[PDB]
PDB file of C-alpha atoms and ligand atoms in Angstrom:
ATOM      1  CA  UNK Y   1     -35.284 -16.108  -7.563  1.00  0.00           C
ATOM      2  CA  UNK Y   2     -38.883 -16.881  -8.546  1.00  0.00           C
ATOM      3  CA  UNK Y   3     -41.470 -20.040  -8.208  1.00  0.00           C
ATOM      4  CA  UNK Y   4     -41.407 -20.619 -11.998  1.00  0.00           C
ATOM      5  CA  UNK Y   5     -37.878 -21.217 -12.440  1.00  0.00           C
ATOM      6  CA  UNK Y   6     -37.312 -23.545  -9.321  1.00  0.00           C
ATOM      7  CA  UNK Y   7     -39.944 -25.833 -11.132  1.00  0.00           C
ATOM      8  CA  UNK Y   8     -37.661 -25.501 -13.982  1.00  0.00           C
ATOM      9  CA  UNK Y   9     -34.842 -26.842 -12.089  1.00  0.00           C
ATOM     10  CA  UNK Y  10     -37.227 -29.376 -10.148  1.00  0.00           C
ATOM     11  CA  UNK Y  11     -38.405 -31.176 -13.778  1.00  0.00           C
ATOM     12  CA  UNK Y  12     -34.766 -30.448 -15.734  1.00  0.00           C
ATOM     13  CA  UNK Y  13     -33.291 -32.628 -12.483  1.00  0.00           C
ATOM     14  CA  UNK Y  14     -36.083 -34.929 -12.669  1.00  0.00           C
ATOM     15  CA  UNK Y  15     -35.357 -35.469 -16.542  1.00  0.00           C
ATOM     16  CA  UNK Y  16     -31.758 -35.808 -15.820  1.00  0.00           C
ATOM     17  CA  UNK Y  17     -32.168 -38.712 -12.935  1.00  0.00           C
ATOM     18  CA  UNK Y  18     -34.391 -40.416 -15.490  1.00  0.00           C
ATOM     19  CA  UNK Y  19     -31.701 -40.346 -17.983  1.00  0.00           C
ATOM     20  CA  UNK Y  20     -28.931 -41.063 -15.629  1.00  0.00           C
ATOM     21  CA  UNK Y  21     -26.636 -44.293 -15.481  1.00  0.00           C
ATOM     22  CA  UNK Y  22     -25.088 -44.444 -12.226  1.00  0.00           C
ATOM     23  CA  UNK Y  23     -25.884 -43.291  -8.406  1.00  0.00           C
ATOM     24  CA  UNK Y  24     -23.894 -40.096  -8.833  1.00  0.00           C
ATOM     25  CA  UNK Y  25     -25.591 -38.719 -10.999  1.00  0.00           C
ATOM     26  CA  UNK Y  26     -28.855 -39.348  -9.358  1.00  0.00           C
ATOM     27  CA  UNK Y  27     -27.412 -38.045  -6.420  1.00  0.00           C
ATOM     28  CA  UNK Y  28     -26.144 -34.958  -8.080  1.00  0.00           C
ATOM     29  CA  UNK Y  29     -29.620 -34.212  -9.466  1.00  0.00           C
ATOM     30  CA  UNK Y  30     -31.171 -35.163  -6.140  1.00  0.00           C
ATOM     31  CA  UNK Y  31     -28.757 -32.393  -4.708  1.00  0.00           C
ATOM     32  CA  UNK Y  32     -29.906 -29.693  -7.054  1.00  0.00           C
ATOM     33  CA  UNK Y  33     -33.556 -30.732  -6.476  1.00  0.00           C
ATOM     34  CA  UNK Y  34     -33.639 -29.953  -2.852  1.00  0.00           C
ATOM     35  CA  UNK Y  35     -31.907 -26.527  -3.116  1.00  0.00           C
ATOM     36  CA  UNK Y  36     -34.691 -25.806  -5.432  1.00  0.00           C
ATOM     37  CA  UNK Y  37     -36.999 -27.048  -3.219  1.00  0.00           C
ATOM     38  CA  UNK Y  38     -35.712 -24.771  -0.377  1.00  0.00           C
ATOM     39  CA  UNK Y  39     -35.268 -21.932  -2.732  1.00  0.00           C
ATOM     40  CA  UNK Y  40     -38.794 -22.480  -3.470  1.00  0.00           C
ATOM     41  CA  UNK Y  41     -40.067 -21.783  -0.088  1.00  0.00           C
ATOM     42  CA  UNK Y  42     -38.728 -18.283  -0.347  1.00  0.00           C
ATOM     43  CA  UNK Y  43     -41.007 -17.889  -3.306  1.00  0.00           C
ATOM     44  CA  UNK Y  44     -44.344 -16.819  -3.861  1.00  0.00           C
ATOM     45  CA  UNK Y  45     -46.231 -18.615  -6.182  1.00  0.00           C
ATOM     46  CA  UNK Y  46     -48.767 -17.132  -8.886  1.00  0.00           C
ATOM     47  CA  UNK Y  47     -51.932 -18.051  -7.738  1.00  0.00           C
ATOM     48  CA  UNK Y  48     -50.703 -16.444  -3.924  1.00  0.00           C
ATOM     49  CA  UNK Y  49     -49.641 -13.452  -5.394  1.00  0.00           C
ATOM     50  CA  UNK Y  50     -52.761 -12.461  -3.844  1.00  0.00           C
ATOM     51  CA  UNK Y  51     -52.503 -13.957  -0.828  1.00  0.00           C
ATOM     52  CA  UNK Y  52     -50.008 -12.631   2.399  1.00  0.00           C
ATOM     53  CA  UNK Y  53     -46.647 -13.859   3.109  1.00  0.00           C
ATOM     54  CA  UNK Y  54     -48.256 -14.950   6.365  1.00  0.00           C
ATOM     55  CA  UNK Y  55     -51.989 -16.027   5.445  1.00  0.00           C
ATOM     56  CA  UNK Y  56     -52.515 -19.927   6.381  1.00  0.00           C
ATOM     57  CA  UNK Y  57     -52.011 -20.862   2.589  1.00  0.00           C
ATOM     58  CA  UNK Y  58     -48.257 -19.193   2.677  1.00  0.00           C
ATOM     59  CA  UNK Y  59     -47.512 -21.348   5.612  1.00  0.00           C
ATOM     60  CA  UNK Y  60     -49.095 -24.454   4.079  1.00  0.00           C
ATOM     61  CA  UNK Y  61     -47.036 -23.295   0.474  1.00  0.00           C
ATOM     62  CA  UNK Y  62     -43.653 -23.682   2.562  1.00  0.00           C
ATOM     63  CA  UNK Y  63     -44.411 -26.895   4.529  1.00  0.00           C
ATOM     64  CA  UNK Y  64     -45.623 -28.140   1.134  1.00  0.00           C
ATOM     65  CA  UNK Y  65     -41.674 -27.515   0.522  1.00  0.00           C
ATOM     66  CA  UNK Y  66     -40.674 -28.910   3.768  1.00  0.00           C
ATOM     67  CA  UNK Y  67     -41.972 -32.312   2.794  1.00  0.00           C
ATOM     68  CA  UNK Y  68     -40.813 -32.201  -0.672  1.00  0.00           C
ATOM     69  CA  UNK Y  69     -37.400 -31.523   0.595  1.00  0.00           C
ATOM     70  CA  UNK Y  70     -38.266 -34.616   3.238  1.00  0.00           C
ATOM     71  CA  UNK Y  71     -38.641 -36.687   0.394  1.00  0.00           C
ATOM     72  CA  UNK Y  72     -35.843 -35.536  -1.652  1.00  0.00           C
ATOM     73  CA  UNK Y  73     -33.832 -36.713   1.051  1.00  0.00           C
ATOM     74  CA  UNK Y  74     -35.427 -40.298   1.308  1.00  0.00           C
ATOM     75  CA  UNK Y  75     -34.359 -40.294  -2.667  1.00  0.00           C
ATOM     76  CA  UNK Y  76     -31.146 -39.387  -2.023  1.00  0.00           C
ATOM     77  CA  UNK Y  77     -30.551 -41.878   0.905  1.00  0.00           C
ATOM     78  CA  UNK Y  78     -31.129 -44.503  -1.874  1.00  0.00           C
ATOM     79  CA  UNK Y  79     -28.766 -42.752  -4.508  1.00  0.00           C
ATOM     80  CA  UNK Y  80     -25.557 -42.307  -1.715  1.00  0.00           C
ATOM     81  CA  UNK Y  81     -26.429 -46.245  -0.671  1.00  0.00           C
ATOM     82  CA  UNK Y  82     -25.505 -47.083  -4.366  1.00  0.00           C
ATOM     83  CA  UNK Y  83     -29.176 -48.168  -5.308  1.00  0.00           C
ATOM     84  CA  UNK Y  84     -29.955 -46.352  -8.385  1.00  0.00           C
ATOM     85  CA  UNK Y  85     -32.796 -48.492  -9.971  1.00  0.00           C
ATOM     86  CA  UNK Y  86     -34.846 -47.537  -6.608  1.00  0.00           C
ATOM     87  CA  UNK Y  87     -33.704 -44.487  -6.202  1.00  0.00           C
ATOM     88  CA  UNK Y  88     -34.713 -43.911  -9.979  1.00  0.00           C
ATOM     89  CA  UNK Y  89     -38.022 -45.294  -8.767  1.00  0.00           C
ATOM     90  CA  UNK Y  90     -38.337 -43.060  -5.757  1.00  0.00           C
ATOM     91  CA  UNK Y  91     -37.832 -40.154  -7.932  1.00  0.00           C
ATOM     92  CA  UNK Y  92     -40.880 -40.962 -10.318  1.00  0.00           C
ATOM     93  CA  UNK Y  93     -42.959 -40.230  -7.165  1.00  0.00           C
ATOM     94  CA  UNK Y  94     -41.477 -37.312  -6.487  1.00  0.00           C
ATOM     95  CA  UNK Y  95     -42.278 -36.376 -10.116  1.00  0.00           C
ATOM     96  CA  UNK Y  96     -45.556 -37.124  -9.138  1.00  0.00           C
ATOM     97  CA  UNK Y  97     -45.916 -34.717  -6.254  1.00  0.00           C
ATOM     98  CA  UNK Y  98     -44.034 -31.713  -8.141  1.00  0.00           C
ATOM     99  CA  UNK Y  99     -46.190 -31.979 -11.215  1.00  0.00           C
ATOM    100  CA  UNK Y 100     -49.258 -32.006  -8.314  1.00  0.00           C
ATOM    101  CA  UNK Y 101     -47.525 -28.622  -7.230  1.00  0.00           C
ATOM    102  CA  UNK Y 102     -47.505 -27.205 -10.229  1.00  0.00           C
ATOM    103  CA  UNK Y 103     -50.942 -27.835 -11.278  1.00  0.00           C
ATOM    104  CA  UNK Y 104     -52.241 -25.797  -8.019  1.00  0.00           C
ATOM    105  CA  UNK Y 105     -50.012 -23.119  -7.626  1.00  0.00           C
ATOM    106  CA  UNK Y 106     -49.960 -22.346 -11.414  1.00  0.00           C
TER     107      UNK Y 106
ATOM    108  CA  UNK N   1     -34.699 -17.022  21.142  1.00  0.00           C
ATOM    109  CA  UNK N   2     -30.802 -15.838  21.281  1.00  0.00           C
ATOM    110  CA  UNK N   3     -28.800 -15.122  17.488  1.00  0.00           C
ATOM    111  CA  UNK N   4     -26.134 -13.670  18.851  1.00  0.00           C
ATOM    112  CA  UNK N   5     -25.015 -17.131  20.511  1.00  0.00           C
ATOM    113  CA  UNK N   6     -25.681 -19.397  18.056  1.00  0.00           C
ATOM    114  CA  UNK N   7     -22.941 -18.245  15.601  1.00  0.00           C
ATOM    115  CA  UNK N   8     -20.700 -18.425  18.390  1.00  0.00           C
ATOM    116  CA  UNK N   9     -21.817 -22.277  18.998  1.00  0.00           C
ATOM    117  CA  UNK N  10     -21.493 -22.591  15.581  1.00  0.00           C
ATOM    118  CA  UNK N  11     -18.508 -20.981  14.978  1.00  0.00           C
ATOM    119  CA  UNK N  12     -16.937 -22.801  18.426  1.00  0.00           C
ATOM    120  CA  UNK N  13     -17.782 -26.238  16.687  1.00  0.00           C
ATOM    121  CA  UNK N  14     -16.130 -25.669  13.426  1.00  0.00           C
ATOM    122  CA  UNK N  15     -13.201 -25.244  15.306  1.00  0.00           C
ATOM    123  CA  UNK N  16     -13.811 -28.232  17.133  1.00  0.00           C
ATOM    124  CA  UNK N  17     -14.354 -30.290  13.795  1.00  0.00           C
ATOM    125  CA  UNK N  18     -10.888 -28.518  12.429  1.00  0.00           C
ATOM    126  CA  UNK N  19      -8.729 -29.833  15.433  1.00  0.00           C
ATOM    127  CA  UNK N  20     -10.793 -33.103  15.807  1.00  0.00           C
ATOM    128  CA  UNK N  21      -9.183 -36.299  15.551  1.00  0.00           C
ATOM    129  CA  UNK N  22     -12.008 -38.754  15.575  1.00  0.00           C
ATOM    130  CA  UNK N  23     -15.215 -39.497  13.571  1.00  0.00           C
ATOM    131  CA  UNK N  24     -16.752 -39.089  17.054  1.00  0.00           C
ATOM    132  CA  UNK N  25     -15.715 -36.030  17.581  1.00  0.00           C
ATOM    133  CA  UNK N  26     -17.065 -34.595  13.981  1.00  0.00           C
ATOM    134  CA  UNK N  27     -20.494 -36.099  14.498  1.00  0.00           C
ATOM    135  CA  UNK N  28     -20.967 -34.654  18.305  1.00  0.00           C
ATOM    136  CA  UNK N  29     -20.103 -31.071  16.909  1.00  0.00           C
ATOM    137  CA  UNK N  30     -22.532 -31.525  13.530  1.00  0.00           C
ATOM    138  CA  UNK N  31     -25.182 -32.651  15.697  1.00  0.00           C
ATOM    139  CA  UNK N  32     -24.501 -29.404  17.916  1.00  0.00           C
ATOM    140  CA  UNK N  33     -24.249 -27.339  14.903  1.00  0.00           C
ATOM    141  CA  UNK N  34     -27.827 -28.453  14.029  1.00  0.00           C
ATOM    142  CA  UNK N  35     -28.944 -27.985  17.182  1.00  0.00           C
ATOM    143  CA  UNK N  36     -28.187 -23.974  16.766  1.00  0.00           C
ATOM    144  CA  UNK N  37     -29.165 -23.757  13.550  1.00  0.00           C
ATOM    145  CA  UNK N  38     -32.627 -25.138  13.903  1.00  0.00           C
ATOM    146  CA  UNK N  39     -32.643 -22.773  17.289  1.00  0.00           C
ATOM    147  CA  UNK N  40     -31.550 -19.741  15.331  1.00  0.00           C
ATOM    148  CA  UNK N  41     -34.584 -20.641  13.066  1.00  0.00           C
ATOM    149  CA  UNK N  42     -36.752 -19.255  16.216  1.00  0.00           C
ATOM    150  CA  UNK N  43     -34.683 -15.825  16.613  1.00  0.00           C
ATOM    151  CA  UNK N  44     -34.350 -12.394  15.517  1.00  0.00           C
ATOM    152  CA  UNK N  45     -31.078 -11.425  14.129  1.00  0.00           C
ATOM    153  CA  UNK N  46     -30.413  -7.365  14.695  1.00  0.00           C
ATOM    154  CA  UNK N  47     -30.212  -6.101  11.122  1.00  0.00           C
ATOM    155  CA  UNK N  48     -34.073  -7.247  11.414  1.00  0.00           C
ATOM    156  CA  UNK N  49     -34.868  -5.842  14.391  1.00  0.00           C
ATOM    157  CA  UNK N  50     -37.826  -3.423  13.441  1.00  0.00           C
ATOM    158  CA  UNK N  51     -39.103  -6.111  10.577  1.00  0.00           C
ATOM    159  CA  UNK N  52     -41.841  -8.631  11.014  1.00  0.00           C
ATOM    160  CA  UNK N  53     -41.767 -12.294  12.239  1.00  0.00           C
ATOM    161  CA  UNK N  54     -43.640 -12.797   9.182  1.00  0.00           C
ATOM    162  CA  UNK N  55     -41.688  -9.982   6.998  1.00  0.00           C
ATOM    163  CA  UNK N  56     -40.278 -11.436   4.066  1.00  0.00           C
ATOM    164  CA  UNK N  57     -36.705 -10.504   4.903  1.00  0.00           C
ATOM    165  CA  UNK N  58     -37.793 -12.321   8.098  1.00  0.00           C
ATOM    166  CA  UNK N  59     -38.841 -15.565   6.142  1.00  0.00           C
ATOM    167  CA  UNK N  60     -35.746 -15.714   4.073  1.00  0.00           C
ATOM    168  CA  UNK N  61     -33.875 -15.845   6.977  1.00  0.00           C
ATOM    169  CA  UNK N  62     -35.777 -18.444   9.095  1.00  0.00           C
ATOM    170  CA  UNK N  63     -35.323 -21.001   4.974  1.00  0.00           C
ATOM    171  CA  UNK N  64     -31.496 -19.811   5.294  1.00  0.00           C
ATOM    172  CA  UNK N  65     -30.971 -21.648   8.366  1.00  0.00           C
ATOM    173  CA  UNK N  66     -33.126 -24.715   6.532  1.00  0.00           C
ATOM    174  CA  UNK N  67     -30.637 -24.434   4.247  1.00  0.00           C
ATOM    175  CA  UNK N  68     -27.871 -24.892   6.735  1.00  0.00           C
ATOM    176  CA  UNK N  69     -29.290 -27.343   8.406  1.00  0.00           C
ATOM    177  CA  UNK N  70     -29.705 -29.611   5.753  1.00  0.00           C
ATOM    178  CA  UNK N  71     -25.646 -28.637   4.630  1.00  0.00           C
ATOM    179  CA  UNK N  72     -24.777 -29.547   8.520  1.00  0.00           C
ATOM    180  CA  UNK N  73     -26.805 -32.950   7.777  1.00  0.00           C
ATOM    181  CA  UNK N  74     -24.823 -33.472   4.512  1.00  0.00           C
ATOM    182  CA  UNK N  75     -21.063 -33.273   6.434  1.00  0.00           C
ATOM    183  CA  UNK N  76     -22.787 -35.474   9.040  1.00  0.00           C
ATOM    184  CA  UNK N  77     -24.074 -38.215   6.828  1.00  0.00           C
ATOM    185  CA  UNK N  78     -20.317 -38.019   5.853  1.00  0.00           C
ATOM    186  CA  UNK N  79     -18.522 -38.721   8.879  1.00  0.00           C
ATOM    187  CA  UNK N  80     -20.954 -41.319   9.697  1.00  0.00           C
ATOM    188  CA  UNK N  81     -20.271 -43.333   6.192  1.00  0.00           C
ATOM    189  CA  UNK N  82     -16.652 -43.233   7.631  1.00  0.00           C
ATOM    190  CA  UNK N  83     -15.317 -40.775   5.642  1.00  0.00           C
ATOM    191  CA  UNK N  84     -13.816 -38.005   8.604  1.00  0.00           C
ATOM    192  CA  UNK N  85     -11.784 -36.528   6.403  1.00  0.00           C
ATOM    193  CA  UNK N  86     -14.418 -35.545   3.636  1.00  0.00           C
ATOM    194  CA  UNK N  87     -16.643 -34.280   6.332  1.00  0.00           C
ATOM    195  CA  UNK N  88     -13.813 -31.507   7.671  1.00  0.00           C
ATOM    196  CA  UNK N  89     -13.594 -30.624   4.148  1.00  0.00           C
ATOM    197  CA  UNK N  90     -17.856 -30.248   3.993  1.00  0.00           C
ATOM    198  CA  UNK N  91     -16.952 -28.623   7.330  1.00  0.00           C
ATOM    199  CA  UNK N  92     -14.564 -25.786   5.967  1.00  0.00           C
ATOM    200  CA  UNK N  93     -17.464 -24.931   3.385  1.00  0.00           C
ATOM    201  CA  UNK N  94     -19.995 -24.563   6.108  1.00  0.00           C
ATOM    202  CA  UNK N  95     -17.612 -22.264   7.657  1.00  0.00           C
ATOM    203  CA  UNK N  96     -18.166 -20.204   4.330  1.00  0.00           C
ATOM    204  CA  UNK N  97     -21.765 -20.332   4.708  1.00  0.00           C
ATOM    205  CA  UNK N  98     -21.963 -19.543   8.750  1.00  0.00           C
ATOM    206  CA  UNK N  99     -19.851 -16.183   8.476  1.00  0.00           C
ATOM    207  CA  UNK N 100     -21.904 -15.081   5.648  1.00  0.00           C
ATOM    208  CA  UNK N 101     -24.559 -15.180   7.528  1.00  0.00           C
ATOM    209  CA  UNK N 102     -22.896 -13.070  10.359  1.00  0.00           C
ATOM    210  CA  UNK N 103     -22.664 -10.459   7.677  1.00  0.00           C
ATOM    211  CA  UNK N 104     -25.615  -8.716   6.199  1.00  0.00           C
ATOM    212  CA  UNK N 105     -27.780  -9.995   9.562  1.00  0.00           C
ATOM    213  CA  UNK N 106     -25.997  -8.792  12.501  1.00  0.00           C
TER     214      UNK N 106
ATOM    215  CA  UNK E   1     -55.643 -30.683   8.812  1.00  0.00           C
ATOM    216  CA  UNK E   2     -56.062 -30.893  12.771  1.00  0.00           C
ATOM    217  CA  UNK E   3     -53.154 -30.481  15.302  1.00  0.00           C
ATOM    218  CA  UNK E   4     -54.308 -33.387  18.108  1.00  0.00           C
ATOM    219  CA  UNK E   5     -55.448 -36.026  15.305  1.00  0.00           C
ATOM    220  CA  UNK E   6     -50.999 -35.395  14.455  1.00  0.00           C
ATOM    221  CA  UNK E   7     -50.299 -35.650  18.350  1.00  0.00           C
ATOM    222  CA  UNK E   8     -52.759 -39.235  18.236  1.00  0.00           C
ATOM    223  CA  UNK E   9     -50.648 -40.390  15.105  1.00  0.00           C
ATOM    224  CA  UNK E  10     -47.396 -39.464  16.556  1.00  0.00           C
ATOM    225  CA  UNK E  11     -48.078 -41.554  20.074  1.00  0.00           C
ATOM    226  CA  UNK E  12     -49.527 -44.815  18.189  1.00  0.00           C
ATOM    227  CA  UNK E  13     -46.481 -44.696  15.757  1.00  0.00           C
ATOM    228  CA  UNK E  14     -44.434 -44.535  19.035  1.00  0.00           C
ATOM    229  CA  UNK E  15     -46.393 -46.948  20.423  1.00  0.00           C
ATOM    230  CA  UNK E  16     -45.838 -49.495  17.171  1.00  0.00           C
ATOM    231  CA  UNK E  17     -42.038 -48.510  17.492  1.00  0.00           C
ATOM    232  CA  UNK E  18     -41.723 -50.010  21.091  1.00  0.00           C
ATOM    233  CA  UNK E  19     -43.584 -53.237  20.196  1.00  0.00           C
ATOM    234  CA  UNK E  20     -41.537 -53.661  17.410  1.00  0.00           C
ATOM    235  CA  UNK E  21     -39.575 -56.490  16.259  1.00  0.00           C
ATOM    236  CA  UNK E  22     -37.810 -55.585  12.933  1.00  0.00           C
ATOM    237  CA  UNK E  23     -35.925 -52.543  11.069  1.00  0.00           C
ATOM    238  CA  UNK E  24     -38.674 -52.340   8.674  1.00  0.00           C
ATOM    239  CA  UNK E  25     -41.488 -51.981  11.292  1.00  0.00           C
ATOM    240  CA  UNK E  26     -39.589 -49.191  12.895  1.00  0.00           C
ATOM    241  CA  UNK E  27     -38.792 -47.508   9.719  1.00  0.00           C
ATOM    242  CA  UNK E  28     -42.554 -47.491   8.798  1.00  0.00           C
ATOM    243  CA  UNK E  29     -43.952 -45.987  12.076  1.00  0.00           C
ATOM    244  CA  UNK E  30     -41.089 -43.328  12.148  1.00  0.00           C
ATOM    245  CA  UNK E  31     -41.761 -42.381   8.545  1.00  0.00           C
ATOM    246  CA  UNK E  32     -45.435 -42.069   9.714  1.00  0.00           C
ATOM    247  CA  UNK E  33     -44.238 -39.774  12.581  1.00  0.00           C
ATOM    248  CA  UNK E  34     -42.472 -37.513  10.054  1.00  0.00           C
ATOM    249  CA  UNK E  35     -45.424 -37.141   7.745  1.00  0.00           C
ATOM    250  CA  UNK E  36     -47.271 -36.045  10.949  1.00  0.00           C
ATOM    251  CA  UNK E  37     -44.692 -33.844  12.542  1.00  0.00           C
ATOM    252  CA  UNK E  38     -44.471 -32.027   9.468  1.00  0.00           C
ATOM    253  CA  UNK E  39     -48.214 -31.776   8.932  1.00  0.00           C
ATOM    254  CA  UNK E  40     -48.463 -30.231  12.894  1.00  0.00           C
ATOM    255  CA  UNK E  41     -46.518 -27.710  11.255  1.00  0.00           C
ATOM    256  CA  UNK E  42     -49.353 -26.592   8.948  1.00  0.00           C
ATOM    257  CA  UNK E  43     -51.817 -26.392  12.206  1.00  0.00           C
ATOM    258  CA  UNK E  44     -52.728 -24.147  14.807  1.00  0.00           C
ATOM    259  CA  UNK E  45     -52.656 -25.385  18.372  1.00  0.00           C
ATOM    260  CA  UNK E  46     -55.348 -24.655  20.885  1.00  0.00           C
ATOM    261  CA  UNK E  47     -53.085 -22.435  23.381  1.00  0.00           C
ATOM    262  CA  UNK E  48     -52.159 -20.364  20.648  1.00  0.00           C
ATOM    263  CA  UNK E  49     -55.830 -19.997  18.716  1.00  0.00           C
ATOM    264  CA  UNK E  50     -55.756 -16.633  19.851  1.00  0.00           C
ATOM    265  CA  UNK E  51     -52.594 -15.900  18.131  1.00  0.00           C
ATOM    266  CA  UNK E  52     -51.437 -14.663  14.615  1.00  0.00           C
ATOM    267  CA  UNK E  53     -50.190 -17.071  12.142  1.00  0.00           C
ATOM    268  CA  UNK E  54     -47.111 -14.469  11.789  1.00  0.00           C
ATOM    269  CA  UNK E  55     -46.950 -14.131  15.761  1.00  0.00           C
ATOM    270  CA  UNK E  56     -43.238 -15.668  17.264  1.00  0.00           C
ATOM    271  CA  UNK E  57     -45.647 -17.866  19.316  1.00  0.00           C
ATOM    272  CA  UNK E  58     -46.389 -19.853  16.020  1.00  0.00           C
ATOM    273  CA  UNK E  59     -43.022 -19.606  14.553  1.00  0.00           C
ATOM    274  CA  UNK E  60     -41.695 -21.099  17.752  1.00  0.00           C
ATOM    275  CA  UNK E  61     -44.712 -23.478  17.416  1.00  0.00           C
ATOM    276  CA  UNK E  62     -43.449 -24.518  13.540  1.00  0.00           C
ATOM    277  CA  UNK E  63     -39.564 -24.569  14.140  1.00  0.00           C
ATOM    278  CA  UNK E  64     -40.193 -27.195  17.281  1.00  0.00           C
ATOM    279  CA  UNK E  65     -41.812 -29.640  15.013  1.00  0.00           C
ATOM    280  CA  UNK E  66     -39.355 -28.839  12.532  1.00  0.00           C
ATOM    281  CA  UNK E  67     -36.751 -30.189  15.403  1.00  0.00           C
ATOM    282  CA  UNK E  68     -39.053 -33.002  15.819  1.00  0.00           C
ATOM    283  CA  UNK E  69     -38.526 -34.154  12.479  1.00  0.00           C
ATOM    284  CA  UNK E  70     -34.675 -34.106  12.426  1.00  0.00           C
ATOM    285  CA  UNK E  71     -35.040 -36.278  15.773  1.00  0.00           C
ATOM    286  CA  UNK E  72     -36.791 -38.700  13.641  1.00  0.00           C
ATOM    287  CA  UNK E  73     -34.325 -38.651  11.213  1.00  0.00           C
ATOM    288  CA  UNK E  74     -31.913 -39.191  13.253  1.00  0.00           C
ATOM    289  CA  UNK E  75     -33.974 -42.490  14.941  1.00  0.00           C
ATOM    290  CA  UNK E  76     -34.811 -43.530  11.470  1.00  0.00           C
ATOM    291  CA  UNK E  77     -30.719 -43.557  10.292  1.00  0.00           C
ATOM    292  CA  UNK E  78     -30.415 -45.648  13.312  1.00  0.00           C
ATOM    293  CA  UNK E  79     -33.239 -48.294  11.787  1.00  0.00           C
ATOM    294  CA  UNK E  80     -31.368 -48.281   8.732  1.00  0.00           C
ATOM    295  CA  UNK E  81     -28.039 -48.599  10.007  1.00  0.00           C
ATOM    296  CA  UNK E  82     -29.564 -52.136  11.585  1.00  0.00           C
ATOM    297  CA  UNK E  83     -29.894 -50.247  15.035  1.00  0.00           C
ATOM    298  CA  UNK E  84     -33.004 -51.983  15.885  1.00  0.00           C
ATOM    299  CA  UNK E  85     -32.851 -51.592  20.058  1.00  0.00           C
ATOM    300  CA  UNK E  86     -31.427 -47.948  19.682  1.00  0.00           C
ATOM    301  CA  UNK E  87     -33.835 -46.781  17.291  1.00  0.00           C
ATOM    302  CA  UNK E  88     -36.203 -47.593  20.094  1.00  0.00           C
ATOM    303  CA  UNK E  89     -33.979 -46.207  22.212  1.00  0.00           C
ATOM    304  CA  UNK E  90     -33.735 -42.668  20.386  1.00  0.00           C
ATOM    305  CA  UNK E  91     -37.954 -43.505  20.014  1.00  0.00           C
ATOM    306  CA  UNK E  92     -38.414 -43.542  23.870  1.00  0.00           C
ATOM    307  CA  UNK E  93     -36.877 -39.479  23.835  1.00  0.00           C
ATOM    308  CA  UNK E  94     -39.006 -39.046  21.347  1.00  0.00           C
ATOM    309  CA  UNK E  95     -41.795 -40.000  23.297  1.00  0.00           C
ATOM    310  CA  UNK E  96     -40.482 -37.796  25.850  1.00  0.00           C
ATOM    311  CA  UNK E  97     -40.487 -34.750  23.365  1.00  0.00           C
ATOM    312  CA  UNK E  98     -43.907 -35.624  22.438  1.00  0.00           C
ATOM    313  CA  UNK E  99     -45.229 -35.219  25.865  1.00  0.00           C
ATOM    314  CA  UNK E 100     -43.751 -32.048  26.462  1.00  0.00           C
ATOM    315  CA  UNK E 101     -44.974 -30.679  23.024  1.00  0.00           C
ATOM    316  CA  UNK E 102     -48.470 -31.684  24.219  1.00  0.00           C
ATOM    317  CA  UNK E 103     -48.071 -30.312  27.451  1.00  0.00           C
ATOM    318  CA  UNK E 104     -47.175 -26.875  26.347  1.00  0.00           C
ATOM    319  CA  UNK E 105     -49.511 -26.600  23.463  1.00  0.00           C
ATOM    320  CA  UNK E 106     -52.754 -28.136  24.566  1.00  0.00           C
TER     321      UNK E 106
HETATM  322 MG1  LIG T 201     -54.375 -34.295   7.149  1.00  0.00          MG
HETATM  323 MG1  LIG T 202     -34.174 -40.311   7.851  1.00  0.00          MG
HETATM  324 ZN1  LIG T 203     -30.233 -38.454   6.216  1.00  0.00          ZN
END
């Protein structure tokens, strides 16, 4: 796919582990999240449309997904323990770095 | 590095996981299975034999075998919450995924 | 960022692992070694200024560090598990694959 719509699916999961009651839904959404994420780094965003597949910004655009996906992970750790008020919490800061994403690579 | 090989391992330790008995067992071969994954990361498969290390048919498969290894890490967190038995079954869908990939890249 | 200010910040979080006492010190340090693994993916070594950013050298350079963060993970899981002494344990290899990383690279 394209940039555009895995930060579609990054902020629809987002809303949904907001709205969520229980860990497995978190967890779910968590699950979607980082398969964006990694779909993501197959992507090339607008602003780089310019830019090579291999020029330093590229490389710093995937690793920029590598750590996202990192801290998907340390959100989901939270939602499989059963902890969904902190994973909840986690997941905020993850908002946090996506909508940080978006606003550069726009 | 060496594709060819790391299917095999791969392939080798799903059929270690189907006959296994233990949780023990399970874990060893997920944590083998990542090993090759991560190490096919570094390779050329042949269908991209003339292509770039930086092509983007090149890059998408290098985030492909991110994508596996973070499957592999799912069945492992699995077995290691005790469950053996939901891990073979995470384990027959990586076999899905892993002879996919065989296809279309070799 | 800088590749040997990452190498520094990986060998004083190993350093805080081994003198530590609790799950939570552990946990910090190796989250700090993750951040810094994955950021020595973004950077270009010395031995390989000479080299493309697409080159396999780099790619090699990139999927190693992508290895070193899985061994973290793995290290941290023990820290969570309340695996104090083998999270150390798993630390002390990592330490060893530290070395070797500066060796090669330097
Ligand atoms: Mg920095
Ligand atoms: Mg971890
Ligand atoms: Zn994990």
């Amino acid at each position: 796919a394209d940039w555009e719509d895995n930060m579609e699916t990054l902020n629809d999961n987002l809303k949904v582990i907001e709205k969520a009651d229980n860990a497995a839904q978190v967890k779910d959404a968590l699950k979607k999240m980082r398969k964006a994420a990694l779909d993501a780094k197959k992507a090339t965003p607008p602003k780089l449309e310019d830019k090579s597949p291999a020029s330093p910004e590229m490389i710093d655009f995937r690793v920029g997904f590598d750590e996202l996906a990192w801290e998907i992970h340390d959100a989901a750790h939270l939602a499989k323990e059963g902890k969904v008020k902190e994973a909840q919490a986690a997941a905020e800061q993850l908002k946090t770095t996506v909508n940080a994403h978006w606003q550069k690579y726009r």
